[PDB]
Amino acid sequence: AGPHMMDPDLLADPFTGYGRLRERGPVVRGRFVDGTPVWFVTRYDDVRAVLRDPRFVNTPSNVPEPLRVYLLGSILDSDPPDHPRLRRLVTRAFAARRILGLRPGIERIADRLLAELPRREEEDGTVDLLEHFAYPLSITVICELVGIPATDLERWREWGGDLVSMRPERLRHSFPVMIDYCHRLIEQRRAALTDDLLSELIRAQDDDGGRLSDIETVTMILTLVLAGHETSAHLIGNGTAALLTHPGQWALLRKDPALLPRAVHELMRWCGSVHVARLRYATEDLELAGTPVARGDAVQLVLVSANFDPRHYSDPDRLDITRHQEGQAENHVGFGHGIHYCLGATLARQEGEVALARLLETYPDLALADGDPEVRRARLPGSWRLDALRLRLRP
Ligand code: HEM
Numbered sequence: 001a002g003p004h005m006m007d008p009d010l011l012a013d014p015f016t017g018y019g020r021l022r023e024r025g026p027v028v029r030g031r032f033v034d035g036t037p038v039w040f041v042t043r044y045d046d047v048r049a050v051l052r053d054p055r056f057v058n059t060p061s062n063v064p065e066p067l068r069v070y071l072l073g074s075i076l077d078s079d080p081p082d083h084p085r086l087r088r089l090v091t092r093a094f095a096a097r098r099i100l101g102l103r104p105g106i107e108r109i110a111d112r113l114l115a116e117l118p119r120r121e122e123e124d125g126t127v128d129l130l131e132h133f134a135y136p137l138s139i140t141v142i143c144e145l146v147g148i149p150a151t152d153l154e155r156w157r158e159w160g161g162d163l164v165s166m167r168p169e170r171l172r173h174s175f176p177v178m179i180d181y182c183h184r185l186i187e188q189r190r191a192a193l194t195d196d197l198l199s200e201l202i203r204a205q206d207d208d209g210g211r212l213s214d215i216e217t218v219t220m221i222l223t224l225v226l227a228g229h230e231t232s233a234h235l236i237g238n239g240t241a242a243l244l245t246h247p248g249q250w251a252l253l254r255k256d257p258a259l260l261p262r263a264v265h266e267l268m269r270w271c272g273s274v275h276v277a278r279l280r281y282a283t284e285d286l287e288l289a290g291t292p293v294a295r296g297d298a299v300q301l302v303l304v305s306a307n308f309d310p311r312h313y314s315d316p317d318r319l320d321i322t323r324h325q326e327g328q329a330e331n332h333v334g335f336g337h338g339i340h341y342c343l344g345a346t347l348a349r350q351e352g353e354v355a356l357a358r359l360l361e362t363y364p365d366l367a368l369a370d371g372d373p374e375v376r377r378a379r380l381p382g383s384w385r386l387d388a389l390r391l392r393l394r395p
Pocket residue numbers: 075076077087223224225227228229231232235272273274276277278279303333334335336337339340341342343344345347348349
């Protein structure tokens with residue numbers, strides 16, 4: 001039967017647990033959260049090889065009928081020949097938006113949130129960085145990227161939560177409501193374009209002149225909120241916990257904040273919030289690192305064990321924010337690889353860099369509230385997240 005993704009030891013310590021399978025062999029049979037059979041692929045080179053292989057696709061072998069297309073149509077569920085067009089349109093929109101020009105706006109959001117922080121302390125004088133900094137920053141950045149009005153922040157926060165939980169008794173109401181909200185925002189921006197990402201999505205053109213349909217644009221908005229909201233927040237939370245538990249790294253960055261871009265690469269590798277890829281499926285019988293894979297078989301790529309692969313990294317278990325060299329090409333799979341590579345990666349790297357920078361400058365003596373932060377580590381299959389991160393702002 002093999003390892004199951006809800007196995008307690010994998011949930012509690014995926015580093016050790018998937019690292020064991022990694023060392024046992026490149027391809028090991030096991031079970032998806034479903035109990036569904038999977039092949040665990042766990043080593044750096046095989047993970048990348050599978051993510052580059054067109055023989056591995058994302059389509060496998062209570063919500064109403066007109067609304068279904070808004071979930072089935074998400075780009076991460078899309079295969080060639082449909083995926084390249086969708087990918088081109090949204091990435092052309094990102095390029096016209098100029099993601100790096102967003103850095104001052106991200107700083108302003110982070111500074112604003114950091115100034116509020118002392119007013120969110122509990123009775124013990126500690127403050128939860130997740131609820132009052134990381135989560136608000138991530139959802140504010142995404143909403144402002146898209147062009148969602150500030151007054152609708154809370155609504156989108158709720159809608160984001162609705163989308164992750166997918167309870168029918170909730171979604172049979174809110175899903176139509178949010179789809180209609182999006183179509184109206186599209187028609188509003190069309191009649192008066194601005195410089196937000198929605199306007200660039202409306203304006204984007206494929207080389208033959210083709211455009212996104214409004215249903216595709218709505219689907220893309222939902223997809224962006226869902227894919228960027230919680231991942232980014234837990235990069236910030238994990239990375240902050242990583243630095244405070246390794247105080248020389250925190251000290252290094254407070255002395256040399258110009259190290260942040262390289263540091264963020266190592267934090268992605270060492271504690272990125274996503275540990276697995278979406279399930280892949282073989283389209284034909286094939287040989288994968290010496291294992292016969294049958295057409296229709298599901299493969300679970302394990303990003304975390306690849307990012308800790310001693311075949312590729314020297315002493316991977318160490319946190320070392322100087323590991324990545326100045327000007328070195330990206331050298332981890334925490335954002336994936338190949339055609340489904342995270343299209344939010346530039347935004348996420350900027351978010352984490354800015355969040356850390358402002359946190360370092362505004363609370364240079366930030367401390368863990370007394371505790372191993374890991375006590376708050378959620379037990380999530382393929383994700384890596386803290387329920388909270390309680391800190392003391394000042395000595
Ligand atoms: C630190 C935060 C993030 C992490 C760790 C992360 C991780 C990933 C990974 C590993 C994939 C590839 C999944 C696969 O191939 O099965 C992916 C894809 C994707 N990400 Fe992210 N992501 C992050 C932030 C974001 C943000 C902020 C956005 C939106 C602005 C975003 C949007 C997307 C989308 C749309 C895809 C699907 C791309 C496609 O299928 O062509 N992500 N992400």
